[PDB]
């Protein structure tokens, strides 16, 4: 059975939009602020993946053993309806 995982990060912005955010810079425990633009209000950016399993346990594992293989952590929300986990 296949479940979902939404990995999100925080953003702040203001055609041209200017934004900044904190990012991992070599090491899980270390972050750094950065600027970025395109061509003042809070925001959130999300990438989604789906590892296939059988229950909402193994999923919870693989999804924790993925935030492991990356500098990901934070709060975890779960909607059973869409089987969606949400790290932030």
């Amino acid at each position, epitope marked *: 059975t296949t479940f979902k995982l939404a990995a999100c990060v925080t953003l702040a912005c203001t055609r041209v939009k200017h934004c900044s955010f*904190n990012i991992t*810079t070599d090491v*899980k*425990d*270390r*972050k*750094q*602020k*950065v*600027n970025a633009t395109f061509y003042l209000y809070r925001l959130i950016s999300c990438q989604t993946t789906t590892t296939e399993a059988v229950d909402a346990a193994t999923a919870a594992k693989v999804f924790k053993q993925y935030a492991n293989d990356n500098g990901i*952590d934070g709060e975890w929300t779960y909607d059973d309806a869409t089987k969606t986990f949400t790290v932030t």
Partner: antibody
Amino acid sequence: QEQLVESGGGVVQPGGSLRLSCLASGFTFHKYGMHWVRQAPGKGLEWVALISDDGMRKYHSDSMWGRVTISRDNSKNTLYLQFSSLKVEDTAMFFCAREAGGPIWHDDVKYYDFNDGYYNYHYMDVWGKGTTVTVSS
Amino acid sequence: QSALTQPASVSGSPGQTITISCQGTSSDVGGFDSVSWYQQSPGKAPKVMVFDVSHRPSGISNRFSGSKSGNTASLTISGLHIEDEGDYFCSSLTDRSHRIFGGGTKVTVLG
């Protein structure tokens, strides 16, 4: 062995100019912002100027603005203070002090500023001996 | 550009508790939790005793403590030792990212 050593102090005439310097050692100079603080004979400490680690942002007190310029040369661990249009009143001991700083902790993750730069902790954790500047006619 | 206001002079016996106040404005002391206190011993350079209102750097005795209320901050030394003698200066971050110091307080440990 964090150490700061000021020099260049001496006698100047009002209206004139003079450059002070502060030699740093015992720590990574270019990671820390730096202050100048003066103390007139028998008076209290008075903040003069602050310059960011990379030397791109400068701040000068309102009472000395126009008579001071702060700068630094990270390639030789030195902080400078350029005087001009000096007043008799500017006579004082000038101190070189380091701005405490580093990452900001939220959980177990260290957050650094633009270009992995330290945030300021808003206190001075290293001071020099100070050098005397005498403005006299 | 006018310094923070402190009492010119205070004193107490060894082992006595004393407090020094630091009067400011909403643009400095009452605008941030960034009040630091420095001690200046005769001959020596200044030295941080308390930062961020009530925090102590590594090495400083628990005797020293600070608090803040509105536009005034305070440093308390509960149990004066002889080495506490000297001049004390409060300091605050400003809303313009400057620093401003208080006029200074002479602390005498009655001997």
